[PDB]
Structure formats: structure tokens, C-alpha cells
Write a protein that binds this ligand. Structure first.
Ligand SMILES: [Ca+2]
Ligand SMILES: [Ca+2]
Ligand SMILES: [Ca+2]
Ligand SMILES: [Ca+2]
Lengths: 220, 221
DNA sequence: CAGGATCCAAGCTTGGATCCTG
DNA sequence: CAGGATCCAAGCTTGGATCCTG
């Protein structure tokens, strides 16, 4: 079930490539919803089960004994990312003199097993296909880009400049809301340093960034 | 649902006095377990339902708008508390130089609606009676005793001396574990002032203290 | 188009407490 | 005896993400 080897995980990943959500859900005796409107994480959770990841786990990475993070990536009919990719929650407090090297973002993006999946709305959920895995490590350039955005976004957060934060900041990674709705709150830092109530935020990779990953892969 | 005034809450409390757990649960269409081994907070939830408090709620007081905390108190055949009373989780971190005046314990114990309930093991759960409420405010003496224990206990906590803490400390209030089991953990302060993983502790009123409240209630105090 | 808003699963934490072994 | 250990229910929070106006 849970792969004990990196070779095991990749082979298990190679083997589900080409399957439709219906076929895989069938094997795992997992019911398939009509669509993702009220099961937004169903596909990500489907792949976790098929690959041996623990459901609901809060570990730094899906496979801590391998140092591998698993992420599904919805792609459109032309091979382009359909959505941005959620990475992790931005620490709004207890962010003192935090460095990039020890960041959650870095930890989660150091080694990613990308599982591209069809996301086109015109295709019935049951029939969407699972693509071929892409075992990824950020290039020296990609990591410099991520680090730069992380530092810029974090400076904004640590300085209580949350009001100035928009999704438009960041070259390849951005901050957008991450919660139940626009009324969700978590502790943050105000304009004077007081601990305030604020909208929880998460780091997201932009579509251009993941599109670059898919492109480099195709070029191989 | 939620009482809007104090006379409403108190009249309702006085009206359920004398009912057995079975009669109350039946009224509420709530199933009654065989015993409390795997339903330790069942009686407490039962009273919350009957008095309009909210289930699952994590507010400081059960009835914040009224400034009242609801607490069942198990009593034996002779009228003596059967167990200590849980008050609240002791804050093991970010405890800085907080004072008793604005502590959770003081707040929670500023006004308590005690609902004594039969707890004798020889009485089938369904047949146990709910007693008459005791609407209590600590006397200067009681508050003084609590405050003293609170500070002595909080000192051990704030100075990273959790290793030294046992339930034997405190005159009327003590610290005992509070969690799933002895493997439960929450953040605390270690010997070097660093944040560590440690057993979650809770403030409990000793049986002598709640007994005092009951005794004072009978005497006419 | 895509920034801001929104939804589910399940582990985690808290509040309700009583249990149980020398 | 009673200190140390333990158990349920229900919010709360986090990891999985896609939805949806203007
Ligand atoms: Ca996971
Ligand atoms: Ca993952
Ligand atoms: Ca309550
Ligand atoms: Ca209560």
C-alpha cells in the first residue's frame, strides 16, 4: 500500500497513467461525484489513495520517508494548466526572522511528483484521464524565482502590510485566500504590530510557472 | 434554546430539579447509555441541552450574555462530591505575566450554576436524579484561596518547572492531566525556557472545595 | 480571465467529564 | 483513595483543491 521505496512509488505512478478517474475510483471502491463543485479535492484525494499517501495527513510532505510531495495538476484540452497550484498556508504570525531555506514552501516544492489530470468541464468526471507522472526538482532558476517571490511576499506579511497584499504580487508565485470563505479568519500582524484577525492566505504557483514545468517535460 | 434573561435560565433550572436522567433524556429524545464509562460527559451534555447552552461550544462561559457558567456536580448517596470538578485547560505558553484578575479560571468561576446530580454507581443511569441548582459566586475567602492556588501553580508553569507538578499542589484547586491519554501533548515551557511538547494539564477543584459550597448552601450561606 | 471566494474530508483540539490500579 | 489516565462529541483547522463574477 504505502510505498517504502522511491522506485515503488514511481512504478505505481507509471501504472495508473492512462486510467480514467472512473476506472481508478472503481478499483479503490471509491464513489465518483457528478462533478467537483462540492468535492473540490476529490481528485487529489483519489491519487493519494492510489499512491499510498495518508489521507488528511499534516506532514510536511506526502511521503516524508522519501522526501516527496504529491500534487495533481489539472490540464485543459490543449495541455495547459487549468488552475493555479496551491502550495501551502502562509504563516501570518510567528514569522520572526524566517528564512527561505527552512520554509514550508521550499520543503513542499523541493521534490514534487506531479500527476497531470484532465480538468476540462466538458468531460464527465468519470471519464477524465490521469496523465503520466512528472518527477520534478526545481531548476536553479526556478528556485531563485520562488525564493524571490517568497521573500517579497513574506516581507509584506511580517511588516503588517497585509492590506497591501493582492494576488497580483509575485513573478511565479502569489498569495490568494485559503479558507472556507471570505469570512474565515486567522491571527495576523496589524499595521502597528498588534495581533489582528485576518483572512487566511496561501501560496499558489501561477499557471505560467507550472506550464513551464509541463513544457520542459514535453521537450524531453 | 438559549435563555434570554437570568430568571428564565434559573426558573428552567429549578423546574428540571427532581427529574431522573431517563425522564429528561426521553423528553429530549436522547438515547441513554448503560453507564458513563464510554460517555463521560453525557450528563453534562444532557444539562446543556435542557438549559439552552450550546453543544460543542468553546466560549469562555456557557451563557456569556448572562455571565453564567454551567457545571454538573456528581454527588454520592451521602451528598458528597464523587469527583473533582474540571475548570479549564491551564495555559502552558504565552502565559507571560498574566494576572489572576483576567485569568480563565477566575472568569469561568465568577458565577457558576451548579447542577448537582446523583452519581452513585448502584443507581442505574436512567434512575439518577438531577438536584436543585446552586447559583454560586465565590466568597472573598473562596476567591482568595483560588487565587493563591492559581498563582502557585502558574509559577511552576511559567518558570518551566512542569516536571515538579503533581496533583498534590494547591489547597483547594489542583493541576491534573486533561486529554485523550498520557500520550497527549500540547506546547509548554521546558527547563531552559524553550518551548517543548508536554502533557496537557487542567485546573480542577478539589472535592473539599465543592463540598464546602454544598455545605454552605445547606447552612444558609 | 483570473483574482477573490468558496467547499469537503478528516485529523486536531477543546469542553463535557469519569475511570481505575496499587 | 485519589492521583494519574482516559473516553466521547463536536467544533476548529488544515490539506485537498475548483468555483465564479464582473
Ligand atoms: Ca497529503
Ligand atoms: Ca500533496
Ligand atoms: Ca459548554
Ligand atoms: Ca460548562
Amino acid at each position: 500500500m504505502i510505498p517504502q521505496t522511491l522506485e515503488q512509488l514511481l512504478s505505481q505512478a507509471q501504472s495508473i497513467a492512462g486510467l480514467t478517474f472512473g476506472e481508478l475510483a472503481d478499483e479503490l471502491h471509491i464513489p465518483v461525484p457528478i462533478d467537483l463543485k462540492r468535492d473540490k479535492g476529490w481528485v487529489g484525494m483519489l491519487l493519494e489513495r492510489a499512491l499510498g499517501a495518508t489521507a488528511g495527513s499534516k506532514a510536511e510532505q506526502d511521503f516524508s520517508h522519501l522526501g516527496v510531495e504529491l500534487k495533481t495538476l489539472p490540464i485543459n484540452a490543449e495541455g495547459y494548466p487549468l488552475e493555479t497550484t496551491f502550495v501551502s498556508l502562509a504563516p501570518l504570525v510567528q514569522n520572526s526572522g524566517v528564512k527561505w531555506e527552512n520554509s514550508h514552501v521550499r520543503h513542499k516544492l523541493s521534490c514534487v511528483l506531479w500527476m497531470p489530470i484532465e480538468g476540462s468541464r466538458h468531460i464527465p468526471l468519470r471519464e477524465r484521464h490521469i496523465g503520466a507522472p512528472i518527477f520534478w526538482k526545481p531548476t536553479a532558476e526556478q528556485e531563485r524565482q520562488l525564493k524571490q517571490d517568497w521573500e517579497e511576499l513574506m516581507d509584506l506579511i511580517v511588516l503588517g502590510k497585509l492590506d497591501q497584499i493582492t494576488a497580483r504580487i509575485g513573478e511565479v508565485m502569489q498569495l490568494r485566500p485559503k479558507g472556507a470563505n471570505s469570512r474565515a479568519v486567522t491571527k495576523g500582524i496589524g499595521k502597528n504590530g498588534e495581533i489582528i484577525d485576518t483572512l487566511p492566505l496561501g501560496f499558489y504557483l501561477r499557471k505560467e510557472f507550472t506550464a513551464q514545468i509541463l513544457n520542459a517535460f514535453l521537450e524531453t
